[PDB]
Design a protein around this ligand. Structure first.
Ligand SMILES: N=C(N)[C@H]1CC[C@H](CNC(=O)[C@@H]2C=CCn3c(=O)n(CCS(=O)(=O)c4ccc(Br)cc4)c(=O)n32)CC1
Ligand code: NA
Lengths: 8, 30, 252
């Protein structure tokens, strides 16, 4: 699963 | 119904273009 | 999806990925019905036998996707859930009847060419289309086989089967809030939804105004694509007034 931005 | 601008696809219907298999659906609608 | 093809870019702009926070995982499919509301299957959030009971804080909604795993940088939008609402009569104890849940977003999503809401059927649309032999379309990032994973969104076009047929295909008790779709063993065409596809949309295109309508939600089936078995969906028009109640009682 590619990495999602932590802002989220 | 379920929106207002609902169900009209910016890339297809809005541009009058058809997706590759929508005709099979449309063709069953007896 | 089993025996389908990859979705065209922008083809199902109301598709939503139900994504869990940790382990970062795909939990289910879903659909955007406005800019602050998403509809899925309640089995996605609540399924006690499986110890499944997810809260607003356990997940994210990813809208605008084509790729299953990559993060679609200037294309996909990620939302946090404001509140979850399960049908009060969801029967997880026997046949999953009333399998539908609403999720209301922390803030409204902006539309784009890849993000656009599906229409909810009215009584007359439900009335002309939901007919044995008419084909609807299912989408999801789900299994490709019953027993692997696509890279991008799959689609399959399936026929609505006559009730009796549906009825004589299982030992499970079918209710008026359900419908089944799939080819018969004799038809020599196949495909179904599978695990990972739950909560996605079964949508139809109106010949009268040529708008797409969400007619069903992905719910249950025995195996994926078995000969002589059909996939069962939540009948969206029949739970239609619960839908308007919550949105009125709680949103927009
Ligand atoms: N193949 C398909 N078209 C559908 C297949 C299955 C999936 C996912 N299903 C499920 O999440 C759902 C949800 C909860 C439990 N579960 C099952 O025990 N069974 C499979 C066995 S069964 O169909 O006889 C069954 C149906 C309802 C109940 Br309640 C229990 C068991 C099933 O399908 N369900 C969606 C696509
Ligand atoms: Na089948």
């Amino acid at each position: 699963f590619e990495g999602i931005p932590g802002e989220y | 119904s379920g929106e207002a601008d609902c169900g009209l696809r910016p890339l297809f219907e809005k541009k009058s273009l058809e997706d590759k298999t929508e005709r099979e659906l449309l063709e069953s609608y007896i | 999806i089993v025996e389908g093809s990859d979705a065209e870019i922008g083809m199902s702009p109301w598709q939503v990925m139900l994504f869990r926070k940790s382990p970062q995982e795909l939990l289910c499919g879903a659909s955007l019905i406005s800019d602050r509301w998403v509809l899925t299957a309640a089995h996605c959030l609540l399924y006690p036998p499986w110890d499944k009971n997810f809260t607003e804080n356990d997940l994210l909604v990813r809208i605008g996707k084509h790729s299953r795993t990559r993060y679609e940088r200037n294309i996909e939008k990620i939302s946090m859930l404001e509140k979850i609402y399960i049908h009060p009569r969801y029967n997880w104890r026997e046949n999953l009847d009333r399998d539908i849940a609403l999720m209301k977003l922390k803030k409204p999503v902006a539309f784009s060419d890849y993000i656009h809401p599906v229409c909810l059927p009215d009584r007359e649309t439900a009335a002309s289309l939901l007919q044995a032999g008419y084909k609807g379309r299912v989408t999801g990032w789900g299994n490709l086989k019953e027993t692997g994973q696509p890279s991008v969104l799959q689609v399959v076009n399936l026929p609505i089967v006559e009730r009796p047929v549906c009825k004589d295909s299982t030992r499970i008790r079918i209710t008026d809030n359900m419908f089944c779709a799939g080819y018969k063993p004799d038809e020599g065409k196949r495909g179904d939804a599978c695990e990972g596809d739950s909560g996605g949309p079964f949508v139809m295109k109106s010949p009268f105004n040529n708008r797409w309508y969400q007619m069903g939600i992905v719910s249950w089936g025995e195996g994926c694509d078995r000969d002589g078995k059909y996939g069962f969906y939540t009948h969206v028009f029949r739970l239609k007034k619960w839908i308007q109640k919550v949105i009125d009682q709680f949103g927009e």
